[PDB]
CSV table of C-alpha atoms and ligand atoms in Angstrom, one decimal:
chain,number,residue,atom,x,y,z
K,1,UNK,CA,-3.8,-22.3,-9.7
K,2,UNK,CA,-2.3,-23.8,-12.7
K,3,UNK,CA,-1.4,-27.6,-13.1
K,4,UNK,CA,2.5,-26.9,-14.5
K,5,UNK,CA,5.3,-26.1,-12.5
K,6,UNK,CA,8.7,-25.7,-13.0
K,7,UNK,CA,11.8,-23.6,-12.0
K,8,UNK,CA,10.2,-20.3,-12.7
K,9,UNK,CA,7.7,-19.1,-15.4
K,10,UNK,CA,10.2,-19.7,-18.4
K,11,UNK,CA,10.3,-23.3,-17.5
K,12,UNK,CA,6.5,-23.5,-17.0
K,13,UNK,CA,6.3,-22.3,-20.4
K,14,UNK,CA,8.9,-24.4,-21.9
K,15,UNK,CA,6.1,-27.4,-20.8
K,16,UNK,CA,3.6,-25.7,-22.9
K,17,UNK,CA,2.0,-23.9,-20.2
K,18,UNK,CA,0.4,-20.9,-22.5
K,19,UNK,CA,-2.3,-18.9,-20.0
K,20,UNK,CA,-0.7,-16.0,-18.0
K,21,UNK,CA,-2.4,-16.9,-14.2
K,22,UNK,CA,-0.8,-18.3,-11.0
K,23,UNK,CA,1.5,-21.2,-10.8
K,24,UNK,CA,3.3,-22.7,-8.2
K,25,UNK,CA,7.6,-23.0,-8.6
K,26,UNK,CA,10.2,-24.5,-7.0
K,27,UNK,CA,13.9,-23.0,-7.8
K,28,UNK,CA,16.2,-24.9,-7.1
K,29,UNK,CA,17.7,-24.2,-2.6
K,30,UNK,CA,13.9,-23.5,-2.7
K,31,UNK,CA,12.7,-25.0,0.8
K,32,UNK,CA,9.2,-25.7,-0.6
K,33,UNK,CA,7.0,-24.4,-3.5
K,34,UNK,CA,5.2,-20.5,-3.6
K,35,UNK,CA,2.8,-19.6,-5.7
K,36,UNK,CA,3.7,-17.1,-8.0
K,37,UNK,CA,2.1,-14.8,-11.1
K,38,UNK,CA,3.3,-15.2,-14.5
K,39,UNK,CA,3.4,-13.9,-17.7
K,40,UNK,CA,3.3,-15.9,-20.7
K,41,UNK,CA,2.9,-14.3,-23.9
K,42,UNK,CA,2.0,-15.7,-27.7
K,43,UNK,CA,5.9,-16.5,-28.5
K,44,UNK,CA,6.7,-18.8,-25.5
K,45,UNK,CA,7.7,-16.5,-23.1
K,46,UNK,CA,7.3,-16.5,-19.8
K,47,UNK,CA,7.9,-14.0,-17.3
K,48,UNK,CA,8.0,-14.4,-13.2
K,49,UNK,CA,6.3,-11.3,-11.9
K,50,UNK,CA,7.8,-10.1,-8.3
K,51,UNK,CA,6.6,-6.3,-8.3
K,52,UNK,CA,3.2,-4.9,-9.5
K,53,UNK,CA,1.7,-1.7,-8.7
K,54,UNK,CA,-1.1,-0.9,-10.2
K,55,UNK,CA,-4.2,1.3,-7.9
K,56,UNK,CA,-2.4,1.9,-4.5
K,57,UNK,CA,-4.2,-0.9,-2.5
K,58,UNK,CA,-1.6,-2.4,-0.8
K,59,UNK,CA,0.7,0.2,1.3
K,60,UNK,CA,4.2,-0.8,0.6
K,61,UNK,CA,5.7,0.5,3.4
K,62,UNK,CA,6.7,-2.6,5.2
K,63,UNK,CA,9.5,-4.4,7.2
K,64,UNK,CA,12.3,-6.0,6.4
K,65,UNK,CA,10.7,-9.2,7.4
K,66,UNK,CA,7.3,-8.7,5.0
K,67,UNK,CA,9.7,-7.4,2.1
K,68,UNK,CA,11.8,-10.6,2.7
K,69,UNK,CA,8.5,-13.1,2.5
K,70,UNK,CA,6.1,-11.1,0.5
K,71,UNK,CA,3.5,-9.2,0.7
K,72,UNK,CA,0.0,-7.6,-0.8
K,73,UNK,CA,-2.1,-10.3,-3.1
K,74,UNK,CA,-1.6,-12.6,-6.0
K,75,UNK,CA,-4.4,-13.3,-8.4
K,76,UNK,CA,-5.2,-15.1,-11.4
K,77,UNK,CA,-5.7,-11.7,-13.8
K,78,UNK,CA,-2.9,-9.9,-12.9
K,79,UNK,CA,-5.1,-7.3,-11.2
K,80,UNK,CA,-3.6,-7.0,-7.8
K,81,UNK,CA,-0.4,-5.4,-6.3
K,82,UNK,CA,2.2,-7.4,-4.3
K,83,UNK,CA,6.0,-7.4,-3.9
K,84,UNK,CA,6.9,-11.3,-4.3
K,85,UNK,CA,9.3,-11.3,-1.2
K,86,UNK,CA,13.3,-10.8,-1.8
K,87,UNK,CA,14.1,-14.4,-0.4
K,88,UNK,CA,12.1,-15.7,-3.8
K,89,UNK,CA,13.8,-13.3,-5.7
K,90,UNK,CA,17.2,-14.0,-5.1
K,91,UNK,CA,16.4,-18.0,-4.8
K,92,UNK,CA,14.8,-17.4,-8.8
K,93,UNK,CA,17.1,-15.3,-9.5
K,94,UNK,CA,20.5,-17.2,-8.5
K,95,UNK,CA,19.3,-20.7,-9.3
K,96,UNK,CA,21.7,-22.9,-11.1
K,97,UNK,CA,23.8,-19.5,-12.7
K,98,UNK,CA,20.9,-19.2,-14.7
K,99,UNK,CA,21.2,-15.6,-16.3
K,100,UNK,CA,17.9,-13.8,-16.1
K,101,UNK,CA,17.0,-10.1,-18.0
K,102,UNK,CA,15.1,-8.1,-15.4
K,103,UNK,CA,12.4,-6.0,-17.4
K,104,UNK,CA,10.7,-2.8,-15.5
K,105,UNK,CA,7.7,-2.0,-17.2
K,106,UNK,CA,6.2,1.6,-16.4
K,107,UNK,CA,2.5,3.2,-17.5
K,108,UNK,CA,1.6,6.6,-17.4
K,109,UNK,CA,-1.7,8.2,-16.4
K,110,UNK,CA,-2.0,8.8,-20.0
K,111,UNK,CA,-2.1,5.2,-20.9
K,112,UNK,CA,1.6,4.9,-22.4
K,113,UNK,CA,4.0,2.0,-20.8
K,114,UNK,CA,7.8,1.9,-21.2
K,115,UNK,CA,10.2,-0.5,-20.3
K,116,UNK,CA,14.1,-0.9,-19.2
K,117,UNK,CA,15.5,-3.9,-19.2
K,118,UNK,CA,18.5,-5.3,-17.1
K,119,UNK,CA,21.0,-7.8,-17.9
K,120,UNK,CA,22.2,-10.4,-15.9
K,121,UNK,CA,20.0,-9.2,-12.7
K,122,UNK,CA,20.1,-11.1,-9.4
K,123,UNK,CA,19.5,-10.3,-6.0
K,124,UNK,CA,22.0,-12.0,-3.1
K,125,UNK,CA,20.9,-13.9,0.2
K,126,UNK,CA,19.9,-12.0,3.3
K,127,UNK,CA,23.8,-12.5,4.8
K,128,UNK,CA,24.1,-9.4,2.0
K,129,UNK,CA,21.3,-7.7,2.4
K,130,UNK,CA,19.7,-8.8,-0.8
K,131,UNK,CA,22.1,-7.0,-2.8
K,132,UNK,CA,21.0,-6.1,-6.4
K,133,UNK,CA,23.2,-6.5,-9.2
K,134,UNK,CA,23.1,-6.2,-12.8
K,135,UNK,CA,25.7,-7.1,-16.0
K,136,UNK,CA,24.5,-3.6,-18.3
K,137,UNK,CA,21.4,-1.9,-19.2
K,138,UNK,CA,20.1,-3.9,-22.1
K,139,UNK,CA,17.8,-0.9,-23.7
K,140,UNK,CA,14.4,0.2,-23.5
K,141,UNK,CA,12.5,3.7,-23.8
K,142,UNK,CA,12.0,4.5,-20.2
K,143,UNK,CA,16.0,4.9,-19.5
K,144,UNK,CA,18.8,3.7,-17.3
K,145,UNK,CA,17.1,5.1,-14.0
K,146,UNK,CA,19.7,2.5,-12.2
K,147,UNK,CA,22.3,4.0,-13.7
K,148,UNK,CA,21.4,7.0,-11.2
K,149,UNK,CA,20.4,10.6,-11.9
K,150,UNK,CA,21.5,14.2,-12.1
K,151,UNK,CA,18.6,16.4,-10.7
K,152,UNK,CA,20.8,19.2,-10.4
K,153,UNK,CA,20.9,19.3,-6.7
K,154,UNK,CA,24.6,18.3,-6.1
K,155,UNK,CA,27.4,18.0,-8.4
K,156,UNK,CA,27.1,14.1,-7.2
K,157,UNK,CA,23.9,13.3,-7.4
K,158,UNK,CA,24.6,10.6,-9.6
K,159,UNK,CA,27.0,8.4,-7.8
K,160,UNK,CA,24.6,9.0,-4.9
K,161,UNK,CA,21.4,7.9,-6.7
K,162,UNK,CA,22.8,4.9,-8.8
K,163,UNK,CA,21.1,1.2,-7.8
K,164,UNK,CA,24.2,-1.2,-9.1
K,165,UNK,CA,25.3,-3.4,-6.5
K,166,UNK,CA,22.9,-1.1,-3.8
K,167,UNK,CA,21.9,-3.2,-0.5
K,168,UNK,CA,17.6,-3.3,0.4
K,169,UNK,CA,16.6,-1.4,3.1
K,170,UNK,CA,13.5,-1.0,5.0
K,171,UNK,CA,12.8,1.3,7.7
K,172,UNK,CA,14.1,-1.5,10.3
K,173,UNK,CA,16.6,-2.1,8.1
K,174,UNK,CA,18.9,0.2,6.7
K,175,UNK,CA,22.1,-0.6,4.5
K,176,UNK,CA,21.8,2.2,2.6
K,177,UNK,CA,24.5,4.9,1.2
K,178,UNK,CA,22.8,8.1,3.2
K,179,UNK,CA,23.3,9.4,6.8
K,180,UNK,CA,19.7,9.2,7.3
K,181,UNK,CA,17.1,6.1,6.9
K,182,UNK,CA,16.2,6.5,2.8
K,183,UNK,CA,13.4,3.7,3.6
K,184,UNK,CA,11.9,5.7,6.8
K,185,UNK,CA,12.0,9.2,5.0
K,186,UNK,CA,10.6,7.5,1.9
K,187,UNK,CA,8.0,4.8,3.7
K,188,UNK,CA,9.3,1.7,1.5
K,189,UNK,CA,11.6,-1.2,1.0
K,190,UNK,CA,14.2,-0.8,-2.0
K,191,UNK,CA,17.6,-0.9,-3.2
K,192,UNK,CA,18.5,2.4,-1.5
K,193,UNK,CA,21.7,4.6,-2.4
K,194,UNK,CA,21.3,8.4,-1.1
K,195,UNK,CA,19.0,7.6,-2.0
K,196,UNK,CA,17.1,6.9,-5.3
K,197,UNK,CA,17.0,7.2,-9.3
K,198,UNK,CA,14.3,4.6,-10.0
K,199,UNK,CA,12.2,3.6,-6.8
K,200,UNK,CA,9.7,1.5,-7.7
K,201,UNK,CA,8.3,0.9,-4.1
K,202,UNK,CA,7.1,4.8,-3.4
K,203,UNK,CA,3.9,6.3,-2.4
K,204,UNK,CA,1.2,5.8,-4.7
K,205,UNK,CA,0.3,9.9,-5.6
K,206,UNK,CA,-3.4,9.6,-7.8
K,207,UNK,CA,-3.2,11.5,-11.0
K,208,UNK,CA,0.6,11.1,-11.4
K,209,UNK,CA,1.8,14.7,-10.5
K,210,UNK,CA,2.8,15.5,-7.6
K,211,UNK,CA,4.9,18.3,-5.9
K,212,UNK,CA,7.1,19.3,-2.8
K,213,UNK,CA,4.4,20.7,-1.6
K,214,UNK,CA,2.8,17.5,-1.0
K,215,UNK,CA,4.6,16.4,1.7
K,216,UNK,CA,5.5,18.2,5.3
K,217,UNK,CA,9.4,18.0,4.4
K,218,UNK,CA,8.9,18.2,0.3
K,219,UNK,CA,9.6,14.3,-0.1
K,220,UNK,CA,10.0,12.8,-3.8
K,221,UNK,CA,8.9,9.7,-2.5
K,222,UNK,CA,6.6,8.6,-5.4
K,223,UNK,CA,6.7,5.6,-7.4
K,224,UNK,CA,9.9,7.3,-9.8
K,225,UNK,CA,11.9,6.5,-12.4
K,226,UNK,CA,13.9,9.3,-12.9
K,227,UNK,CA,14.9,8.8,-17.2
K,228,UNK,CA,11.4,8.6,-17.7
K,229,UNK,CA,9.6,11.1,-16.1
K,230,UNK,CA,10.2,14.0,-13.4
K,231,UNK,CA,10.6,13.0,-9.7
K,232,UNK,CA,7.2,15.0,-9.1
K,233,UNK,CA,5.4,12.6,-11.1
K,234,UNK,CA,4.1,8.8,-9.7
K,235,UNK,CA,3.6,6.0,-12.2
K,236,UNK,CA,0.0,4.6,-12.8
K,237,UNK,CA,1.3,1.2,-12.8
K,238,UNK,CA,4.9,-0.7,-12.7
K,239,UNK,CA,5.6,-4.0,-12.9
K,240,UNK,CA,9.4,-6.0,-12.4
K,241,UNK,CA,9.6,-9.1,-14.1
K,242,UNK,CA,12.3,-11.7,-14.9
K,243,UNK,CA,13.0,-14.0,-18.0
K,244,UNK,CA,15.8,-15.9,-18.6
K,245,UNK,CA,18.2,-14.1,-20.8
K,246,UNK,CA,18.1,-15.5,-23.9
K,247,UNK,CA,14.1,-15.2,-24.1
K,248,UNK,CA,15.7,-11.2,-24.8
K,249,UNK,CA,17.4,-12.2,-27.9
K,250,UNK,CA,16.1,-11.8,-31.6
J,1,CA,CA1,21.4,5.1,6.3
């Protein structure tokens, strides 16, 4: 662990911290210090990592009280799969009105990563359900999947699989936008509609491809992001990171 801290990864780097690794922050409403991963790269950026997938060790489907602290395993390569816990993210991402850019950041089992990026993200306190929300898609090659998604199924299949101002669910928890439990049929923790456009959290499916045929009842429940690829294919690895805004602009 890493000598710096600050108020997440940007501020870290702003005191000339320059080796991605583990670092312990303290944002501001923060009852004490957690460890976290970031990312610092050759210009001075530095990202606060709170998803990472990456070889379907950990099993993300988990309760509401393991999404809200964290889970999986941190390490000092950036190696190791972990959700960062969604009270950190919203205490990171609300602190002081500091505007933070999301960035998802999607590989392929061919080797090719993609990114969206989200504007103005934060996530609210537990009394809301850690409610995401975002200002506007700010670009990037693998698509607006939180804009939601026509998969020709229903003519509304795109109000019902948007993520803007979506509540988290878990399978003990469920604020979703669907009659049934999205986090029980799926087996994850996410910012549920009816249920999902990008889902992040999913089953990790080796190889990618996968089918209805995978599942008993024909779930998509992979690790999706609908602009990007198919629903019947799983990413190799994702990550969710967060930078202060202005790290974005050229
Ligand atoms: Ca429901």
């Amino acid at each position: 662990i890493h000598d710096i801290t600050g108020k997440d990864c940007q501020d870290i780097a702003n005191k000339g911290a320059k080796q991605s690794g583990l670092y312990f922050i303290k944002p501001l409403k923060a009852n004490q210090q957690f460890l976290v991963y970031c990312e610092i790269d050759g210009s001075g950026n530095g990202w606060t990592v709170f998803q990472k997938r990456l070889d379907g060790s950990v099993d993300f489907k988990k309760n509401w009280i393991q999404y809200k602290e964290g889970f999986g395993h941190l390490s000092p390569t950036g190696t190791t799969e972990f959700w960062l816990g969604n009270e950190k993210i919203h205490l990171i991402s609300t602190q002081s009105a500091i505007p933070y850019a999301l960035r998802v950041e999607l590989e392929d089992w061919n080797g090719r990563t993609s990114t969206a990026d989200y504007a103005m993200f934060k996530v609210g306190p537990e009394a809301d359900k850690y409610r995401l929300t975002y200002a506007y898609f700010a670009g990037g090659d693998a698509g607006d999947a939180f804009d939601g998604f026509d998969f020709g199924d229903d003519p509304s299949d795109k109000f019902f699989t948007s993520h803007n101002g979506m509540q988290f669910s878990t399978w003990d928890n469920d604020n979703d936008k669907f009659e049934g439990n999205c986090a029980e049929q799926d087996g994850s923790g996410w910012w549920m509609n009816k249920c999902h456009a990008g889902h992040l959290n999913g089953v990790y499916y080796q190889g990618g491809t996968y089918s209805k045929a995978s599942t008993p009842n024909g779930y998509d429940n992979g690790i999706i992001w609908a602009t990007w690829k198919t629903r019947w294919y799983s990413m190799k690895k994702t990550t969710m990171k967060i930078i202060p805004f202005n790290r974005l602009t050229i």
